[PDB]
């Protein structure tokens, strides 16, 4: 015998997980976040893009759409921490966002077999984007220069300090 023996064999069984007293209470947002405000995206594809905050999803994310006809940011969800809220807001009593939810953003049911080793916007997404943007653009035209403001990107110039900046 190369190795004599283990006398005390550990039991193969898995011990049951202790009961967890950690419920999922609903997430509060920062008081500066009001549906209809103009956020400033900070992370990801659309950094520096002004957007419009529409609905707080149950995914603890934010459903934003800076009007696609203006800045090109689609109906997409972002994280409430990677966005800077601003004092400016736009009226949103004319846009319907009830149908928006998590599985409307369900990307693709990926399995370990449907993996592409080497390396088409849904018509439903575009039409549902249009009926939203019609309400955003229609409201946004009352305030002057905000369409230009929303179109342009945001950047930290030289010599201005974000710790003492008010957005």
């Amino acid at each position: 015998s190369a190795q004599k023996a283990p006398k005390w064999y550990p039991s193969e069984d898995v011990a049951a997980l202790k009961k967890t007293r950690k419920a999922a209470r609903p997430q509060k947002l920062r008081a500066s976040l009001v549906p209809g405000t103009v956020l400033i995206l900070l992370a990801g594809r659309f950094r520096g893009k002004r957007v419009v905050y529409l609905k707080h999803l149950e995914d603890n994310t934010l459903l934003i759409s800076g009007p696609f006809k203006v800045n090109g940011v689609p109906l997409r969800r972002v994280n409430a921490r990677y966005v800077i809220a601003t004092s400016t807001k736009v009226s949103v009593e004319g846009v319907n966002v009830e149908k928006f939810n998590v599985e409307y953003f369900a990307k693709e049911k990926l399995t370990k077999k449907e993996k592409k080793e080497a390396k088409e916007i849904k018509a439903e997404r575009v039409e549902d984007q249009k009926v939203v943007d019609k309400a955003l653009i229609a409201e946004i035209k009352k305030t002057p220069l905000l369409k230009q403001y929303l179109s342009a990107s945001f950047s930290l110039k030289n010599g201005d300090k974000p710790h003492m900046l008010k957005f």
Partner: protein, 127 residues
């Protein structure tokens, strides 16, 4: 794979090389506590090597575990490997260095048929 275990940390990874083992070739690499009256290692000065302590002892729940999470068990023949058939999840078989190449193939064939994980499947293969 292996049964659930806490994230294994060694709490010290650099080997405790003997003092001056680099300086003098005669001084072997294996650790020997320096027991001199003037030894800086013994006196535990700042900026010198760390001597082994009992504090460095690994977690008792994760002792003698390979990173894969299996305890190394060194098997040589078929019957000793038959001992682990009901303990695939916790033990991994290592064929001894003196097992012939023609004798490893029956062990490897038997181990894969019993689900036993072998950590040296490529040992002494002929190709």
């Amino acid at each position: 794979a292996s049964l659930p275990h806490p994230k294994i940390v060694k709490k010290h990874t650099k080997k405790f090389k003997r003092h001056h083992s680099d300086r003098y070739h005669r001084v072997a690499e294996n650790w020997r506590k320096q027991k001199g009256i003037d030894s800086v290692v013994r006196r535990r000065f700042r900026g010198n090597i760390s001597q082994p302590k009992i504090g460095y002892g690994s977690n008792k729940k994760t002792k003698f575990l390979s990173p894969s999470g299996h305890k190394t068990f060194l098997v040589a023949n078929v019957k000793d490997l038959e001992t682990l058939t009901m303990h695939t999840k916790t033990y991994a078989a290592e064929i001894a260095h003196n097992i012939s190449a023609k004798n490893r193939v029956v062990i490897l064939a038997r181990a894969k048929a019993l689900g036993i994980k072998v950590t040296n499947p490529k040992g002494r293969l002929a190709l």
